Amino acid sequence: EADLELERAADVRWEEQAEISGSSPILSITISEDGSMSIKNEEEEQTLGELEDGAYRIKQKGILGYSQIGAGVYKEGTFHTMWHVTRGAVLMHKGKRIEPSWADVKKDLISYGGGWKLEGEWKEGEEVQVLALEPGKNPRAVQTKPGLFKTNTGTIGCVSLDFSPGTSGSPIVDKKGKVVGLYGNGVVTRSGAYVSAIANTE
Ligand SMILES: [Cl-]
């Protein structure tokens, strides 16, 4: 079984176009390795192809090529993703090994390369953007207003499960550019609706 491989997709920022219209292409300043950057301007899931923050796709190669199994965010020397995406596996990026540094399986989080560094705090009422890296799609910022719900994990901010499951680990940002959490920790509300927690810790 092949190692999981990282692919830089986009900068981590708030996109003002998505604040205006609801969504936007992410308009990255640094080089991207995914296919949104190419002359085709289209991501190809099966192909693959640090001093700046970035959102990454997480891919694994099989006999038919790569599949994107998730996403994560590199920030201040640490790569952050969901526990269910990697399950503790080593990641590879351009020949570099990256082993896990910390996890909280209960919160569905794992960091690689140092401790957890996502500093954003969401509070009630506040709009955020999911910087969604869906399999097969170019990076997109999507404006949303999370809900505070009562869930099986407590009373938390949640977003609707409105993206591919292979978007899990994509960063969710506030207007300051801070990462309030990651997409894709599935929780169950009191009534029984499945939603994503904004996945972060305290
Ligand atoms: Cl942050």
Beta bridge partners of 128: 144
Annotated catalytic residue, options 168, 170, 174, 196: 168
Cβ contacts of residue 143 below 8 Å, gap of 6+? 18, 19, 22, 23, 127, 128, 129
Active site residue 3: no
The neighbour count for residue 137, using CB atoms within 10 Å, is 18
Query: Tell me, what DSSP letter sits at residue 123?
Result: -
Active site residue 80: no
Annotated catalytic residue, options 11, 34, 108, 174: 108
What resolution in angstroms does the PDB record give?
1.7
**Distance (Å) from CA 129 to ligand 1 centroid:** 13
Separation between Cα atoms, residue 163 and residue 14, nearest integer Å: 18
Active site residue 21: no
**Distance (Å) from CA 119 to ligand 1 centroid:** 4
Give the chain's length. Answer: 202
Structure tokens belonging to residue 195: 């939603």
Q: Torsions phi, psi of 16, nearest 5?
A: -65, -30
Under a CB-based contact definition with an 8 Å cutoff, are residues 132 and 167 in contact? yes
Under a CB-based contact definition with an 8 Å cutoff, are residues 146 and 122 in contact? yes
Annotated catalytic residue, options 84, 93, 170, 196: 84
**Distance (Å) from CA 171 to ligand 1 centroid:** 9
Experimental method used, please?
A: X-ray
Structure tokens belonging to residue 180: 């309030």
**Distance (Å) from CA 53 to ligand 1 centroid:** 10
